[PDB]
Enzyme design. Structure first.
Site, PDB file in Angstrom:
ATOM      1  N   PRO A   1      70.391  -1.894  19.753  1.00 35.72           N
ATOM      2  CA  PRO A   1      69.000  -1.559  19.453  1.00 35.72           C
ATOM      3  C   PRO A   1      68.335  -0.807  20.613  1.00 35.72           C
ATOM      4  O   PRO A   1      67.278  -0.227  20.427  1.00 35.72           O
ATOM      5  CB  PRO A   1      68.333  -2.912  19.237  1.00 35.72           C
ATOM      6  N   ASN A   2      68.952  -0.794  21.791  1.00 33.33           N
ATOM      7  CA  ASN A   2      68.457   0.016  22.938  1.00 33.33           C
ATOM      8  C   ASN A   2      69.633   0.669  23.631  1.00 33.33           C
ATOM      9  O   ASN A   2      70.537  -0.047  24.058  1.00 33.33           O
ATOM     10  CB  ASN A   2      67.649  -0.779  23.939  1.00 33.33           C
TER      11      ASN A   2
END
Lengths: 116, 121, 108
Positions: free
Chosen positions: A1-2
């Site tokens: 997600p990052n």
């Protein structure tokens, strides 16, 4: 997600937005994560401040840091390390040998989305 | 004690200096760390180089990594979670749900402050 | 294999190449890693953007992230901690007090 990429300062807008798309495209497909939950950013390292084996690029590479929470087995990491790596060789190209993909698992007690 | 905030290229000098005070204040209150121990850096990302869910900001977030030494229990992490989140949704604000906070515990055998690790102090 | 030094945006080219070399040389010796597998990058933080105990440098410093694969034993890490502390005081110089090194283990 990052997903943070450290890369050399040569690349154009277009390579950047297709590189973002691809890392994001490559992420949703492998690990089945939500597209709106995917953040990416790239970081332009100047040739004068990026060294391979001890000397700057200016005197003469693509690094991908993944930030997941720990819900993923080794096989789905193999696929992520694979998917992240492939699509970055497609657009904003570079040899596979010159792309490094790093996975940093974050305990759920240690990642904060909003207050929690 | 190592706080990197990745943000977009808009923010003024005032917002930066206030963001730095706020994250530092948030840290010292939350985890009772020495103010002298708190280093905070902001990373300005061009809109053309920041993607949300597949497309760049210019075509259309706040990410805070903390590298602490490992002593902190669950509750002092969650408070570090909220305190860094609140103070940054206060000054140079953005929506609560658009700030993400990463807590990385580095082992005493792996943190070197001055020549020495924290293990051999 | 991956060394990110965050620093203030004051330093010359020469300090920079001597910093890259000093970090690479301190690396290859201690943990016996391959020079061609040693990547090192410097991240310039402008003074307005680097804060110590709550004030911006400008209103008024080195942090070194090492990401290796996870085999490294205690001593080779403490030596790593020391090799990359010392050779960064030699060039791109700074008092030892104001340098932190961070060791990040990563290994699938």
């Amino acid at each position: 997600p990052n997903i943070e990429m450290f890369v050399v300062e040569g690349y154009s807008d277009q390579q950047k937005e297709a590189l973002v798309g691809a890392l994001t495209q490559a992420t949703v497909e492998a690990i089945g994560a939500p597209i709106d939950s995917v953040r990416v950013w790239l970081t332009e390292v100047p040739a004068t401040q990026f060294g391979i084996g001890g000397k700057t690029v200016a005197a003469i590479e693509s690094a991908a840091d993944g930030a997941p929470p720990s819900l993923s087995i080794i096989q789905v990491t193999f696929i992520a390390g694979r998917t992240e790596l492939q699509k970055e060789r497609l657009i904003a190209a570079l040899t596979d040998a010159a792309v490094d993909t790093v996975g940093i698992e974050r305990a759920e007690v240690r990642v904060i989305l909003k207050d929690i």
